[PDB]
């Protein structure tokens, strides 16, 4: 996260943190998540499809720290790994950029709730807030863009949601934002998400209830001028996250 | 890997 504050996974507590055990033993953060429910993590495909072998990955859930250990943090293995059959990258856009993970614990477990620990409610279909509208972000990804190193402590930012006209204009995106994707960065383009907080979410109070409203996909370079982060519009996925849950 | 941006997390890049 670019900007923003720092935050703690009481106020984030469906954020899951997601690493990837190497040969050799060393372990390193790979990208954010979010509970969906209890067994159920989402994220973004790009952040596997090169590493599709669920056994290496480890998920965190009521975790603020990257290094540390956090007090009721939990423990997880991937039980299943479900990437989007039809990803694909083109130079910066990433299409079906969504992935789910079925967590258990080493008792065969799923997620219990806490206070640091909950699931974040899916938006209804075609129900996405206004463009305008204030929606936040939560990672561990850079702080700089000359970062070569994660932050120890996790971060959030409030972003504005930005329409597709907007994001279409030449000086934008163009065409290569779709109608599957949902913009969003900070007015004043001083804040934004960053390489490390993909897969991460985008919340958005709607209609009183804290809603997933994206999962961080990608951009051109962080906080930068006329380049809004892009975002997995959520609410086009229901039938997919449906059938695969 | 890339270091170019979201969208590089994780990635074999030769």
Redesign the interface.
Known sequence: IIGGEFTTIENQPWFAAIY?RHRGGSVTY??GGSLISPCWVISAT??????PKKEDYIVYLGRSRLNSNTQGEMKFEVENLILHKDYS?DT?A?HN?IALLKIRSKEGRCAQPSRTIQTIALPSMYNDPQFGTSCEITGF?KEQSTDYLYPEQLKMTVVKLISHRECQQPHYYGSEVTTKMLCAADPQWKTD???????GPLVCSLQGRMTLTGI???????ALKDKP??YTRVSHFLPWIRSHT | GX??????????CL
Do not use: K, M, P, T
């Open positions: 990837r790979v990208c790009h952040c596997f499809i090169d590493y990258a910066l990433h950029d990804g998400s960053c390489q490390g907080d993909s897969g961080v996909s990608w951009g051109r370079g962080c982060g892009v | 270091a170019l941006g979201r969208g590089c997390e994780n990635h074999r």
